[PDB]
C-alpha cells in the first residue's frame, strides 16, 4: 500500500459495510492485524486479536493514514 | 635471529645534487603533494628573503638543532626501573630527528600546514625551539642519569 491504496481483508470489509449500511451493531471480531483503517469506518467498535485475547477499541474520526495494527501492542512491560 | 639490511638506490650516483634533488623529487608521497609543495616552496622563498643570507645552511643547522645525539632507554634492574643512556647509530639519529620534526610540527597546531612547517623549521633554526628544547630535555635526562653506564 504505497501508491494504489489501502490493502485489506475484503470479506470482513464487505461484512462491516453491510453492517453499517443497515444499523449499528456489536464489536467486530477479528484476528487480522493486516488492515488499514478506511476513512468510511468512523465510529465502529473493533475487537482485535492481541495474541491472547480480543481487545475492544472504538474508532475515532482521526484515523487518517495509519493501519489498524497499533491499537493492540503485543508486549507488556512493567 | 640476527639483524639484516637490504640495498636500494633511488637517485643517480653522479651529476646529482643531494639536497636540491631531494627537494625537487624525494620522500614525500601519497597525495596532497602538488599545491602543498608549491606553497611550501614559496614558504621557503619567504623565509629565504626573510633571513639576510642563504637559507639552506640555516635549514641544515635547524636539522642539527633538532638532530639528537643521545637518548636514554629504560632497563629493569633492582626495584627502581632505572634508565641507561646509550650512544646512537646514525640512521636512528636521522629517523628520530625527522620523526620529532614532523610530529611536533603537526602537533603544536597553527593556521595551516605550510606556515606551520616553516614555523617549526625557523623554530629549529633559532636555538629557542620547542622540539629543540625536547632534544635538550633528552640530553639533560641523559647527563643527569649517565652515572649508570
Amino acid at each position: 500500500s504505497l501508491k494504489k491504496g489501502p490493502f485489506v481483508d475484503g470479506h470482513l470489509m464487505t461484512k462491516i459495510e453491510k453492517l453499517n449500511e443497515t444499523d449499528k451493531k456489536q464489536v467486530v471480531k477479528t484476528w487480522s492485524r493486516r488492515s488499514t483503517i478506511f476513512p468510511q469506518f468512523i465510529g465502529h467498535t473493533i475487537a482485535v486479536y492481541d495474541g491472547r485475547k480480543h481487545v475492544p477499541v472504538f474508532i475515532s474520526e482521526d484515523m487518517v493514514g495509519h493501519k489498524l495494527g497499533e491499537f493492540a501492542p503485543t508486549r507488556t512491560y512493567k | 635471529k640476527g639483524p639484516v639490511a637490504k640495498r636500494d638506490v633511488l637517485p643517480d650516483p653522479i651529476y646529482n645534487s643531494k639536497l636540491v634533488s631531494r627537494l625537487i623529487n624525494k620522500m614525500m608521497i601519497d597525495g596532497k603533494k602538488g599545491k602543498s609543495q608549491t606553497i611550501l616552496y614559496k614558504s621557503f622563498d619567504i623565509i629565504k628573503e626573510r633571513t639576510g643570507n642563504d637559507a639552506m645552511e640555516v635549514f641544515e643547522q635547524a636539522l642539527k638543532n633538532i638532530m639528537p645525539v643521545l637518548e636514554v632507554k629504560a632497563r629493569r634492574v633492582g626495584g627502581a626501573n632505572y634508565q641507561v643512556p646509550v650512544e646512537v647509530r646514525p640512521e636512528r639519529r636521522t629517523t628520530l630527528g625527522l620523526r620529532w620534526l614532523v610530529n611536533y610540527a603537526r602537533l603544536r597546531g597553527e593556521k595551516t600546514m605550510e606556515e606551520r612547517l616553516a614555523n617549526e623549521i625557523l623554530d629549529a633554526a633559532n636555538n629557542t625551539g620547542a622540539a629543540v628544547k625536547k632534544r635538550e630535555d633528552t640530553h639533560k635526562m641523559a647527563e643527569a642519569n649517565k652515572a649508570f653506564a
Binding site: - | 638506490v9 643517480d12 625537487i24 623529487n25 603533494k33 602538488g34
Partner: protein
C-alpha cells in the same frame, strides 16, 4: 623501430622507439595535462639522461591496465627492455647499475579468517 615490453603490478605497457630527434610521448597526449605525479617525470627523464642516447630516438608508448605507480613501474621495465634490445653494448653496465629486477610485489591473496591476509581480527582473553 625497436620494440619493448614492460609489466609491473597488474599492468602492461609496450614501447616503440625509432630514430627521431629525442621526442617522448605516451598515448599521444602530452606531458602537461596527461602526466601528473612528477615521479613519472623523473621516470621519463632518468635513463635517457644517464645514457648518451637521449636526443637520438623518439618513443611512442601504449598502455594497458593498472594504476599510476604500477603503471610507472611498467614504463620503467618497458624502456629498460627497449634499451637492452636497442643498444646492448652497455647493457651490462645497466645490469650492475640495477633497475632490471621486475619485482614480484603484487597484491596478496586474502586469507579466510583474516582481514587483509596478515591481520587477525582482534583477540581477547
Amino acid at each position: 623501430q625497436y620494440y619493448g615490453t614492460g609489466r609491473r603490478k597488474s599492468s602492461v605497457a609496450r614501447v616503440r622507439l625509432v630514430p627521431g630527434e629525442g621526442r617522448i610521448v605516451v598515448n599521444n597526449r602530452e606531458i602537461s595535462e596527461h602526466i601528473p605525479s612528477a615521479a613519472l617525470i623523473e621516470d621519463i627523464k632518468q635513463p635517457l639522461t644517464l645514457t648518451e642516447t637521449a636526443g637520438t630516438y623518439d618513443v611512442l608508448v601504449n598502455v594497458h591496465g593498472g594504476g599510476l605507480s604500477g603503471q610507472a613501474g611498467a614504463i620503467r621495465h618497458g624502456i629498460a627492455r627497449a634499451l637492452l634490445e636497442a643498444d646492448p653494448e652497455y647493457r651490462t653496465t645497466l645490469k650492475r647499475a640495477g633497475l632490471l629486477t621486475r619485482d614480484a610485489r603484487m597484491k596478496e591473496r586474502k586469507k579466510y579468517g583474516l582481514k587483509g591476509a596478515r591481520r587477525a581480527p582482534q583477540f581477547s582473553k
